From Swiss-Prot:
Metabolic or biological pathway, per its Swiss-Prot or TrEMBL entry: Protein modification; protein sumoylation
Location in or out of the cell: Nucleus
GO CC terms: cytoplasm; nucleoplasm; nucleus; SUMO activating enzyme complex
GO molecular function: ATP-dependent protein binding; enzyme activator activity; protein heterodimerization activity; small protein activating enzyme binding; ubiquitin activating enzyme activity
Protein name (database record): SUMO-activating enzyme subunit 1
Species classification: Eukaryota, Metazoa, Chordata, Craniata, Vertebrata
Main location: nucleus
Function: The heterodimer acts as an E1 ligase for SUMO1, SUMO2, SUMO3, and probably SUMO4. It mediates ATP-dependent activation of SUMO proteins followed by formation of a thioester bond between a SUMO protein and a conserved active site cysteine residue on UBA2/SAE2.
Presence of the UniProt keyword Phosphoprotein in the record: yes
Gene name, Swiss-Prot/TrEMBL: SAE1
């Protein structure tokens, strides 16, 4: 679209977390030509990061992940104002988010995702989150009341979104929810298991301690599925073997989907996925789920 491009080129995006998924998102957004992208990450480069991640030069272990990504990110499009922020996202005051038109979170804890979603909803900022765990990946969008144009021939269409807290808590005890459960990807419950591992451990499952991590994941599988009154065998028993580490192709697929969703929301064209997109790199599937309302 024509005026869609004017919106996109005037848009400023906050991107949190510069592991494998984050640079893929950064690369796509920078190539698309947004006005500015702020890359925020307070963590240091780990030995495992360069395996999926193309913005950081080899041998950067110990460097801050955002600072180590700046040169290659900026080189993608000199017309984009790429900035780095090394401050923990939890330090940020509410006023920090208001300078951005869209916020996208990766590698953030569940509590952080809820808090930032509520800040964005109150200030009408487009909110996204996504992560990759091994062969699996997901994206989430909360665009609030999102207005957009389509074809058929212009069609001004509105789609209502729901907060991430409501999307991450689904009452499966309403009879209506039981029927919808049979057609649920079960990657959604994989997300719940991995998100509480992140909360409990302060980190994601790591292949050097795959040896706890399948261990801890087995408890979360029983802990969350019983908590939600769901059978423990809804998701594969051996799910622990396909949710470890970062694979570059998986980050590419999930980052491409998420970046296109961000572009759709900023340019206000085409129906955005509402509200979850689940990718399984083993079966080659991408599934859109609407959860929360």
């Amino acid at each position: 679209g024509l005026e869609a491009q004017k919106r996109l080129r005037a848009s400023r995006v906050l991107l949190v977390g510069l592991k494998g998924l984050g640079a893929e998102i950064a690369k796509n957004l920078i190539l698309a030509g947004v006005k500015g992208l702020t890359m925020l990450d307070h963590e240091q480069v780990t030995p495992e990061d360069p395996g999926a991640q193309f913005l950081i030069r080899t041998g950067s272990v110990g460097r801050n992940r955002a600072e180590a990504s700046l040169e290659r990110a900026q080189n993608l499009n000199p017309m984009v104002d790429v900035k780095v922020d090394t401050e923990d996202i939890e330090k940020k005051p509410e006023s920090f988010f208001t300078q951005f038109d869209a916020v996208c979170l990766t590698c953030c804890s569940r509590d952080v995702i809820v808090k930032v979603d509520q800040i964005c909803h109150k200030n009408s900022i487009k909110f996204f989150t996504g992560d990759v765990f091994g062969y699996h990946g997901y994206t989430f969008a909360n665009l609030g009341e999102h207005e957009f144009v389509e074809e058929k021939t212009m069609v001004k269409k509105k789609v209502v979104f729901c907060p991430v807290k409501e999307a991450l808590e689904v009452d499966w005890s309403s009879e209506k929810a039981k029927a919808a459960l049979k057609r649920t990807t079960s990657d959604y419950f994989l997300l719940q298991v991995l998100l509480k591992f992140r909360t409990d451990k302060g980190r994601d499952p790591s292949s050097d301690t795959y040896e706890e991590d399948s261990e801890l994941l087995l408890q979360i599988r029983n802990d969350v599925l019983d908590s939600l009154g769901i059978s423990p065998d809804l998701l594969p028993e051996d799910f622990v073997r396909y949710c470890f580490s970062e694979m570059a192709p998986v980050c590419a697929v999930v980052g491409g989907i998420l970046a296109q969703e961000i572009v759709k929301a900023l340019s206000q064209r085409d129906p955005p996925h509402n509200n979850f997109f689940f990718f399984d790199g083993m079966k080659g599937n991408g599934i859109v789920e609407c959860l929360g309302p």
